[PDB]
Amino acid sequence: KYLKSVLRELVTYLLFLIVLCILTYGMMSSNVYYYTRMMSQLFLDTPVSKTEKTNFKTLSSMEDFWKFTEGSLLDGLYWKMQNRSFIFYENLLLGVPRIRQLRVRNGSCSIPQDLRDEIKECYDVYSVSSEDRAPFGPRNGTAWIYTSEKDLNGSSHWGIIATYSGAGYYLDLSRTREETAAQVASLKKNVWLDRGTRATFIDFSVYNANINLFCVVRLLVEFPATGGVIPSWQFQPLKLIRYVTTFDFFLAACEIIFCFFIFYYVVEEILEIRIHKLHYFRSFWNCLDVVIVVLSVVAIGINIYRTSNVEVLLQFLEDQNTFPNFEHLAYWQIQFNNIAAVTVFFVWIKLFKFINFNRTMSQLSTTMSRCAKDLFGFAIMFFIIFLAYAQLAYLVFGTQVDDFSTFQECIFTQFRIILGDINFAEIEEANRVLGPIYFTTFVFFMFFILLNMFAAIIADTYSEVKSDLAQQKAEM
Amino acid sequence: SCSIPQDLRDEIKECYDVYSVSSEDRAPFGPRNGTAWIYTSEKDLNGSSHWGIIATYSGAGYYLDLSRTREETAAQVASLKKNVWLDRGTRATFIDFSVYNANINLFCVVRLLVEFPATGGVIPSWQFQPLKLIRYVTTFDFFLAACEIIFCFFIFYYVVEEILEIRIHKLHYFRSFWNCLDV
Ligand SMILES: *[C@@H]1O[C@H](CO)[C@@H](O)[C@H](O)[C@H]1NC(C)=O
Ligand SMILES: *[C@@H]1O[C@H](CO)[C@@H](O)[C@H](O)[C@H]1NC(C)=O
Ligand SMILES: *[C@@H]1O[C@H](CO)[C@@H](O)[C@H](O)[C@H]1NC(C)=O
Ligand SMILES: *[C@@H]1O[C@H](CO)[C@@H](O)[C@H](O)[C@H]1NC(C)=O
Ligand SMILES: *[C@@H]1O[C@H](CO)[C@@H](O)[C@H](O)[C@H]1NC(C)=O
Ligand SMILES: *[C@@H]1O[C@H](CO)[C@@H](O)[C@H](O)[C@H]1NC(C)=O
Numbered sequence: 315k316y317l318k319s320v321l322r323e324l325v326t327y328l329l330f331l332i333v334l335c336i337l338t339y340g341m342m343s344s345n346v347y348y349y350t351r352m353m354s355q356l357f358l359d360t361p362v363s364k365t366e367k368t369n370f371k372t373l374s375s376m377e378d379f380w381k382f383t384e385g386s387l388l389d390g391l392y393w394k395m396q397n398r399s400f401i402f403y404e405n406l407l408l409g410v411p412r413i414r415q416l417r418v419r420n421g422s423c424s425i426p427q428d429l430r431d432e433i434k435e436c437y438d439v440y441s442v443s444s445e446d447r448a449p450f451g452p453r454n455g456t457a458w459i460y461t462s463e464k465d466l467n468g469s470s471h472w473g474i475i476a477t478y479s480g481a482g483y484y485l486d487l488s489r490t491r492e493e494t495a496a497q498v499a500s501l502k503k504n505v506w507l508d509r510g511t512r513a514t515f516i517d518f519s520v521y522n523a524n525i526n527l528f529c530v531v532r533l534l535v536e537f538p539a540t541g542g543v544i545p546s547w548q549f550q551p552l553k554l555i556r557y558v559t560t561f562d563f564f565l566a567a568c569e570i571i572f573c574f575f576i577f578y579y580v581v582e583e584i585l586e587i588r589i590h591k592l593h594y595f596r597s598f599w600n601c602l603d604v605v606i607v608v609l610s611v612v613a614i615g616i617n618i619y620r621t622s623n624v625e626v627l628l629q630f631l632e633d634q635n636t637f638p639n640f641e642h643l644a645y646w647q648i649q650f651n652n653i654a655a656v657t658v659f660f661v662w663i664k665l666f667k668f669i670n671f672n673r674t675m676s677q678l679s680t681t682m683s684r685c686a687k688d689l690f691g692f693a694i695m696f697f698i699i700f701l702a703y704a705q706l707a708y709l710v711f712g713t714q715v716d717d718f719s720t721f722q723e724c725i726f727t728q729f730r731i732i733l734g735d736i737n738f739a740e741i742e743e744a745n746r747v748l749g750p751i752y753f754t755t756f757v758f759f760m761f762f763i764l765l766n767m768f769a770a771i772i773a774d775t776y777s778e779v780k781s782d783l784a785q786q787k788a789e790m
Numbered sequence: 791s792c793s794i795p796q797d798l799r800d801e802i803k804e805c806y807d808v809y810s811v812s813s814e815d816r817a818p819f820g821p822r823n824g825t826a827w828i829y830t831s832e833k834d835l836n837g838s839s840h841w842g843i844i845a846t847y848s849g850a851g852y853y854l855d856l857s858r859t860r861e862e863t864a865a866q867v868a869s870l871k872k873n874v875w876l877d878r879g880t881r882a883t884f885i886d887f888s889v890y891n892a893n894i895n896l897f898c899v900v901r902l903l904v905e906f907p908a909t910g911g912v913i914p915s916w917q918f919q920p921l922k923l924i925r926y927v928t929t930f931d932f933f934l935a936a937c938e939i940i941f942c943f944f945i946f947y948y949v950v951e952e953i954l955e956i957r958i959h960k961l962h963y964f965r966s967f968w969n970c971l972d973v
Contacts, residue, residue, distance in 0.1 A: 345907065345908065352911045398801070521798075523805045524909070526795070631797050
């Protein structure tokens with residue numbers, strides 16, 4: 315035996331690895347990149363007007379946003395056809411773009427009594443417990459009346475400053491440029507962006523009927539309570555009419571095959587628990603074989619949930635003069651790509667289970683298996699001092715650099731210091747006593763004394779392993 | 791060459807697919823006047839593939855030869871621009887020419903390519919290649935002509951030595967790694 319058992323589980327795994335490769339080949343095409351790039355270089359790179367240089371990426375005031383809304387925005391959405399408006403003469407703008415704002419209410423924080431004669435009013439930072447819900451200005455339409463999240467069919471966004479809800483004051487722009495511009499001018503005249511505003515969303519979607527691939531676009535502008543403007547963007551190439559070409563039928567067949575494979579792998583792994591070895595996990599080849607199954611189950615459930623309800627597309631196709639609410643699908647597509655990309659990584663890592671075909675591949679794995687116990691002990695000691703530097707940098711420089719503004723950024727900056735990437739031209743500006751001292755001590759202690767021990771140990775281990783084999787050859 | 795979904799067939803009246811040999815145009819368009827509006831096969835054009843950035847374009851297509859001087863060339867390209875010679879179906883455009891530059895003896899062949907992807911936009915790509923016709927000019931050449939013959943003789947000697955060695959050692963000659971690098 316041992317060739318009808320340790321090889322059958324390899325041939326059944328090679329087919330799995332081929333089906334997974336076929337499934338991950340069809341997800342990422344080559345036109346998707348240019349489709350996103352052309353749209354990205356249309357709203358974020360053109361200057362707001364011919365006489366200025368700023369674009370959406372470098373907005374720095376509430377007047378720049380107004381210049382962008384009437385200007386570089388309307389020049390991209392509406393194109394005179396050689397009535398609908400194809401963007402690049404292929405990208406059909408379906409529906410109408412929608413704009414929305416979220417604002418806080420007056421008198422929302424506490425003014426110290428000492429200087430209350432100067433501070434007339436304040437507006438607190440954004441929070442669900444301090445969000446305005448009352449009409450303001452002329453109470454004509456839906457742009458001056460608080461509409462809840464339930465009847466907006468909205469959802470949270472998790473922006474940069476905070477996490478904004480799906481309610482607020484919204485307005486659906488028109489279908490032709492000459493009246494959308496009038497609506498924007500009316501919004502600008504009767505001041506719609508007061509100081510109490512905290513967020514603004516502009517969103518739409520396009521089709522590009524040549525290939526079969528939608529594209530939803532959302533642009534966010536955040537106004538922190540400490541003044542300023544922070545822009546953000548998101549372009550997502552959805553696809554909702556999949557079953558058209560024969561290749562789509564082939565992909566459907568290959569994914570039913572994947573479902574069958576995951577069923578087989580879950581049953582033949584349950585069979586090895588109670589009908590066989592009980593409660594032995596510390597092998598790293600069964601702890602990994604469970605992660606793949608769980609991730610695949612999650613990714614299958616997400617995929618079924620995503621394509622089980624496309625009713626928003628049907629509603630839009632019923633009447634094509636409204637706003638297509640494609641925001642939900644664009645989120646689950648990202649959440650599904652984030653899972654289907656991690657499963658492939660672990661499936662590829664699983665190939666190490668079968669590379670022992672000669673007497674020189676066995677010791678190269680024995681070395682790692684015998685130095686993975688000693689490296690783990692030193693890793694904790696390394697990463698404790700790593701975090702000790704990270705938190706000190708966060709507390710000292712994390713106010714005037716922006717390379718240490720948040721703790722994660724502090725960690726990534728040190729990882730980039732290890733690569734020798736960042737230059738310390740501005741570190742000393744935030745502080746001079748601890749400016750160059752921090753850099754020098756960090757480099758010295760973690761690039762000449764602590765980063766080596768990871769090498770030495772490994773080297774030593776390798777040596778003994780070789781002996782621990784060579785002597786065994788001398789015995790025979 | 792495209793399949794609109796039935797759901798929104800009324801809104802899109804036509805779509806053009808991504809370039810592919812199985813989905814190329816072969817019919818005249820616009821004023822069917824001359825060679826710029828009639829499909830010509832690759833054989834009749836003496837062309838070949840290119841392997842551009844988006845795909846691999848064939849050698850056929852709709853072509854036009856310009857004039858020898860500026861005036862008629864400008865008039866002819868303006869006549870092309872007056873009509874619509876670059877419709878929505880156009881997928882690639884090639885411009886080819888060659889120059890001599892007699893001042894220093896060095897030819898040059900120039901090919902420019904513009905690709906219009908099926909998602910709108912323009913992708914340019916150029917290629918210059920200088921050629922030379924220096925054979926037996928000054929008194930420095932003959933040296934290279936003799937060196938070429940010497941090199942050919944050396945290769946003949948090396949191959950005959952290699953065949954002798956491989957005849958003596960009928961096999962196991964393909965493991966020293968100093969024989970693979972010699973063949
Ligand atoms: C905001 O409230 C403060 C205090 O009530 C006062 O300045 C005024 O009522 C409001 N100011 C506005 C709406 O500009
Ligand atoms: C409110 O009335 C119309 C729309 O109902 C609007 O155009 C007008 O500007 C508003 N009136 C004002 C702001 O006084
Ligand atoms: C939310 O969805 C319902 C479902 O029909 C729709 O009637 C309503 O108009 C949507 N909300 C908005 C603000 O369009
Ligand atoms: C493209 O072909 C379709 C198929 O009938 C036709 O309806 C449409 O008018 C054509 N468009 C052009 C520009 O010829
Ligand atoms: C077609 O060519 C003739 C001469 O070859 C020219 O007189 C005529 O104007 C051309 N057609 C058009 C539409 O220009
Ligand atoms: C292709 O080569 C033939 C052979 O000389 C020539 O007659 C023909 O004109 C060439 N094609 C073109 C488009 O010039």
